[PDB]
């Protein structure tokens, strides 16, 4: 019911490395070297109520931690998300979702296509940040990413981008 340092410590010790990286990526617009500092900074700025932390755990799909640490289930978090503004934008969720649907061979192919417009173990989220730093991808600038996803024959992921654009 209350946010505390104990809760932040529990969350940080339970997440694995991939989940920690995803969490840092998802919070790039609310901004940190690591997840504990990130959550502490969010708490200090009044952006880490129990509901905010539940949203973050929901976005990294750690429903076990939602239940065990925050005593909330899926429906409670979805209710909170419908009633309150979202800490993590739909663009960030979409980028992580595309990343989870790409295997390493797909990411290598995508990097080969995109290098002309801009290092072999980079995840998709790493590539997205480099593209954001270069003004090549943004919530309102998805045509290049969509074209490259189409050109590696991931029409399903192009369609996820199209449904996002229609949601806006």
């Amino acid at each position: 019911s209350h946010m505390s340092a104990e809760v932040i410590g529990q969350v940080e010790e339970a997440l694995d490395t991939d989940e920690k990286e995803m969490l840092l990526f998802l919070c790039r617009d609310v901004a940190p070297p690591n997840v504990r500092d990130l959550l502490d900074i969010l708490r200090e700025r009044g952006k880490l109520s129990v509901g905010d932390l539940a949203e973050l755990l929901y976005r990294v799909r750690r429903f076990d931690l939602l239940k065990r640490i925050l005593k909330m289930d899926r429906k409670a978090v979805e209710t909170h998300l419908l009633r309150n503004p979202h800490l993590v934008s739909d663009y960030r969720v979409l980028m992580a979702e595309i990343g989870e649907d790409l295997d390493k061979s797909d990411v290598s192919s995508l990097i080969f296509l995109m290098k002309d417009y801009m290092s072999k173990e980079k995840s998709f989220l790493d590539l997205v940040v480099e593209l954001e730093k270069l003004n090549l991808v943004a919530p309102d600038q998805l045509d290049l990413l969509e074209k490259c996803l189409k050109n590696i024959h991931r029409i399903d992921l192009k369609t996820k981008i199209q449904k996002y654009k229609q949601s806006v």
């Binding site: 024959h153 029409i155 399903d156 369609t159």
Partner: protein, 182 residues
């Protein structure tokens, strides 16, 4: 309808020969690098889903594949589709997704027996390397090789005709029917 369960059941009824046929009929959509690791039908279906050529609301390519490899049992049992519906759909201009050329090569391979396959390989001795004319090669693999060397294509049928005419004239009718249709 449980879509994933249905795809799984369909896949359990397809063995490695049916799979080789399905992969050949998909050659114009799944390139050789992505064909190589496909060892069961579910991997084939996953590739088709990534191209959005297969989903619960879009079964047309899967139906065409099963129709063209003569798995009418699977069409009726798992996709509620009879032969006559498939004939009507695929005779409608613009609806078929497997080219007539690709279908024509598969039908030739359906009509060539083992001894005729040996004769076919003998006919290509001067155009294909020996390691590709080895005994561990069926007619579809030979066609793929001929295509790689541009001695077989939608507009290069001379060598195919020459070899087939030295085996059986029914093969030449399949070729000639295709030419009339195109």
């Amino acid at each position: 309808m449980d879509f994933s369960r249905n795809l799984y059941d369909i896949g359990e009824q397809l063995d490695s020969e049916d799979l080789a046929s399905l992969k050949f009929l998909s050659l114009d959509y799944i390139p050789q690098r992505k064909q190589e690791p496909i060892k069961d039908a579910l991997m084939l279906f996953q590739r088709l889903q990534e191209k959005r050529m297969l989903e619960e609301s879009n079964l047309s390519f899967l139906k065409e594949l099963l129709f063209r490899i003569n798995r009418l049992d699977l069409l009726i049992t798992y996709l509620n589709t009879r032969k006559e519906e498939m004939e009507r759909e695929l005779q409608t201009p613009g609806r078929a997704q497997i080219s007539a050329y690709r279908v024509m090569l598969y039908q030739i391979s359906e009509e060539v027996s083992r001894s005729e396959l040996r004769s076919f390989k003998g006919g290509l001795q001067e155009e294909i390397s020996k390691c590709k004319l080895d005994d561990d090669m069926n007619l579809l693999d030979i066609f793929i090789e001929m295509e790689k060397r541009v001695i077989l294509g939608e507009g290069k049928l001379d060598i195919l005709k020459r070899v087939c005419a030295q085996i059986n004239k029914s093969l030449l009718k399949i070729i000639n029917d295709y030419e009339e249709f195109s």
